[PDB]
Design a protein around this ligand. Structure first.
Ligand SMILES: O=c1ccn([C@@H]2O[C@H](COP(=O)(O)OP(=O)(O)O)[C@@H](O)[C@H]2O)c(=O)[nH]1
Ligand SMILES: [Mn+2]
Lengths: 276, 277
């Protein structure tokens, strides 16, 4: 039960965004600026005392991206809510000392085909080991990125994927799905909804555990059949979200590369961008 | 429940092509507003079939209102959840006056024998415990003096839903007929409110509905002890409940219409469930 709140009335005959699609054929919202009242969403999620887990892999040279990642996350990611950062790394001492706000904590987790399966294997394994006990939602991203604007509770849902910024306006036959029938990730040209990027996905811990476990099993079958998918775990992620439809989809606002694509008018905010 | 779909053939959705240009299709709290053109029913049907879902439909037909049953059931057989398992529940004082109707495969009807204001909320709540929790997955609760004219399907199913009143979908919150006296449990001040929902069409999961109808009943009880009656009875208490507990779906006026009073505007691409004249 929410309390008395003061906010503008939503008008039935005034569309929120006229230049984009805001809901999927399976009735999952597509998150664009102007589709959500953040204050109503903040209060709904505060009233459940929501904790958000955020995972990143920072191994080898990739430890150098952490300072800017964590500093910008403190400015922009789930501000006002409880956050638990999880850092998979081989270099404990290289993790930068970062001042974290109230309700925010960090755990370090000290850990070619092994490399390719690592991400899906390690998220799924740690779901049983730690995540189911410690957080309500899991958010998995790349570390070579920086927050520049709001990324909050509007993304939270049982299961989500994010549109690849290079393909959001492309037709299905042009998507770089795995196209060989001998692979478990196979998607023919008369199938497919969107091309989801492997750099940003999430959901409830249970649904993330299911997705990541499933992708790992399919990868192992591929290895057994002597085949390797064209874009590795990203191919398997797309095959998964085809058959198990996400309950939200995030716009390319949430994954951008300004060097490659600039700042078109269709993006009102550039929230989470690649570091060159 | 996240189900696993088979290979399916259908047109690709387009990110840069708006869904409807004329209507709001998603609430400020990211709940879909269900208009025609927002959903692909092929995909949704398979999702819900893979769950083996049973839908319960409640109607109250007490005294004279029993005359409305024949038309309601015949049209429901043609339009309500066709292809899925349905369990009709008829609350009536006259079991024998229930018309003989032929039901399709996976469709059944039980009569709930009850005696002749706070009635509907309490009785729905009570029979959740007695029958509904074991027998169905979803509960859909409607007025009997109605007919089905077009498709009403799994697109409405969600943990909690309300339907926009046909008279108020284009009104400002000040014009909504909420209970306005602070003394009532149903009280809503002029600067509050998202929509005005009609008491003739609501539902959701059995657990969420059991909770809604339970809370509304005890809220009416408190009012009764203060010697007050809400302006629109159970509908007033329903609106108070849905302002503070946001629905996970909102059904458009397509799902509750009155053509005699309101005609047929352009923004309505279908009339699915309509009042009897
Ligand atoms: O004597 C009555 C009074 C009403 N009802 C039920 O209560 C609902 C609401 O009553 P009504 O339709 O008269 O209210 P309205 O929305 O038309 O103002 C009806 O649809 C019936 O299902 C009934 O069965 N018998
Ligand atoms: Mn009625």
């Amino acid at each position: 039960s929410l309390p008395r709140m003061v906010y503008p009335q939503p008008k039935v005959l005034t569309p929120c965004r006229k230049d984009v699609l805001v809901v999927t054929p399976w009735l999952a919202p597509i998150v664009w600026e102007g589709t959500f009242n953040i204050d109503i969403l903040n209060e709904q999620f505060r009233l459940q005392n929501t904790t958000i887990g955020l995972t990143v892999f920072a191994i080898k040279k990739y430890v150098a991206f952490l300072k800017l990642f964590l500093e910008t996350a403190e400015k922009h990611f789930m501000v006002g809510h409880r956050v638990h950062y999880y850092v998979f790394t081989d270099q404990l001492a290289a993790v930068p000392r970062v001042t974290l706000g109230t309700g925010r904590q960090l755990s370090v987790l000290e850990v070619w085909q092994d490399v390719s399966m690592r991400r899906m294997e390690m998220i799924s394994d740690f779901c049983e080991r730690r995540f189911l006990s410690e957080v309500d939602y899991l958010v998995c991203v790349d570390v070579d990125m920086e927050f520049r604007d709001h990324v909050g509770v509007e993304i939270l849902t049982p299961l989500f994927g994010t549109l690849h910024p290079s393909f959001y306006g492309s037709s299905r036959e042009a998507f770089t799905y795995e196209r060989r029938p001998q692979s478990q990730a196979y998607i023919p040209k008369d199938e497919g909804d969107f091309y989801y990027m492997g750099a940003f996905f999430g959901g409830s811990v249970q649904e993330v555990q299911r997705l990541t476990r499933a992708c790992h099993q399919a990868m192992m079958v591929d290895q057994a059949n002597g085949i390797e998918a064209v874009w590795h775990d990203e191919s398997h992620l797309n095959k998964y979200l085809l058959r198990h439809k996400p309950t939200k989809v995030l716009s390319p606002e949430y994954l951008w590369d300004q060097q490659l694509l600039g700042w078109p008018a269709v993006l009102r905010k550039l929230r989470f961008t690649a570091v060159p």
